[PDB]
Amino acid sequence: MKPLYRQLKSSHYSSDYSSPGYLAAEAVYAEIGYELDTLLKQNPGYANTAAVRMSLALLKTGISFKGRLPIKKGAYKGKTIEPGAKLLADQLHRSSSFGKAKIFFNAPDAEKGIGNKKGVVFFNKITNYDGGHIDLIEPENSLLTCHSHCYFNCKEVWFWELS
């Protein structure tokens, strides 16, 4: 299956404090049975939580992929999380669930290509930001809004439309 935008959103923990769907990074990891501080010590990359948030949301709407972090607690125990944005984007890109992304190389193209659609967005090689960002995007007042944050100052914008 391919998830519905509304339900993927409902199942997605925003890292934006002012979002109705906000959840702190430590609670996200606690949910799947990890202490954030232990993980950061093992690999500081875990501070970038976008792919973990998206992974978990995808799982809850029934999309499974290979990942590299086993969930150790809760309903999804035994399933895997992909903590790397690029690696998650690659999964989606080859999945039959989503298919190939539309890939944009500048902000005008990205914005016109997304248009009034909604879906999954991946910001690749973001200026002054490490690890990329994968998120949900939709229109809001003729602008585009991301559930956590948009990073249009980047080298590539990948987009998968959802209904």
Numbering used by the authors: 1 to 163
List sentences from the manuscript:
Some Gram-negative bacteria target their competitors by exploiting the type VI secretion system to extrude toxic effector proteins. The opportunistic pathogen Serratia marcescens has recently been shown to utilize T6-dependent secretion of two family 4 amidases, Ssp1 and Ssp2, to mediate antibacterial activity. In S. marcescens, the resistance-associated proteins Rap1a and Rap2a neutralize Ssp1 and Ssp2, respectively.
Isomorphous crystal structures of Ssp1 (at 1.85 Å resolution) and the active-site Ssp1-C50A mutant (at 2.2 Å resolution) reveal the overall enzyme structure and details of the active site. The protein is a monomer in solution but crystallized with two molecules in the asymmetric unit, each consisting of residues 1–163. The root-mean-square deviations (r.m.s.d.s) between least-squares superimposed Cα atoms gives an average of 0.3 Å when comparing the four polypeptides in the crystal structures. The copies in the asymmetric unit are therefore judged to be essentially identical and neither mutagenesis of the catalytic Cys50 nor crystal lattice packing interactions induces any major structural changes.
